[PDB]
Amino acid sequence: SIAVGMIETLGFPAVVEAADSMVKAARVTLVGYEKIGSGRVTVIVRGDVSEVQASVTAGIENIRRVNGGEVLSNHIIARPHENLEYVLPIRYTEAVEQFREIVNPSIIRR
């Protein structure tokens, strides 16, 4: 089960710290950055519901690290299932082909 977590700040440096804390505190992907004007900016993360909840909690508190940081709003929205894709840079090709060596073609326990 996946969800979306959002933090809206009044000020750009704070939204950067918000986005950085979220992806560092839980296993989420930073998916969006939106601007509606009037100094209001939002960063959006996506991932497992428990991870999203931990990202948002650890994104709001760390705004206090920013001299001048101010949070406006925050919310979490459940998201439908999706066949999520993740393309890696071509330098990790040697990291992918060896992961295939650690998996085994048999899915049976006994």
Partner: protein, 128 residues
């Protein structure tokens, strides 16, 4: 490309995939193994520990961070979560079937070997 084929495959074979996922989950009731899919040379199902994909996450500097969180959090009683190893890309088969996985397995009356074989035959013909 092959990405669109997996999406249609997941839509068409949601009952068979839900059955295979439930059968695979019965063998590992605590998710000690994750069900996966490797497309090269041919599409075939594989498995790995919850230590191997997280180690890989460190090697790629946390770029499959969300996938390992979804593999950790999904409910096997209601959700199917199968990672696919592509060229240099990783795709999840992530969906909530109707009916639930256990009902899919009982409805089809197939064995895990029969599920693995036939699913491994449909996608290959679909990719080729």
């Amino acid at each position: 490309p092959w990405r669109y084929r997996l999406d249609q495959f997941t839509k068409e074979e949601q009952t068979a995939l839900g059955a295979l996922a439930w059968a695979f989950y019965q063998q590992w009731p605590a998710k000690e193994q994750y069900l996966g899919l490797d497309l090269h040379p041919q599409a075939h199902f594989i498995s790995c520990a919850p230590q191997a994909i997280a180690q890989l996450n460190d090697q790629v500097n946390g770029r499959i961070q969300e996938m390992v969180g979804i593999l950790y959090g999904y409910d096997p009683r209601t959700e199917v979560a199968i990672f696919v190893i592509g060229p240099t890309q990783f795709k999840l088969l992530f969906f909530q079937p109707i009916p639930d996985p256990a009902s899919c397995f009982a409805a089809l009356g197939l064995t895990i070997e029969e599920l693995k074989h036939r699913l491994e035959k449909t996608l290959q013909e679909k990719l080729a």
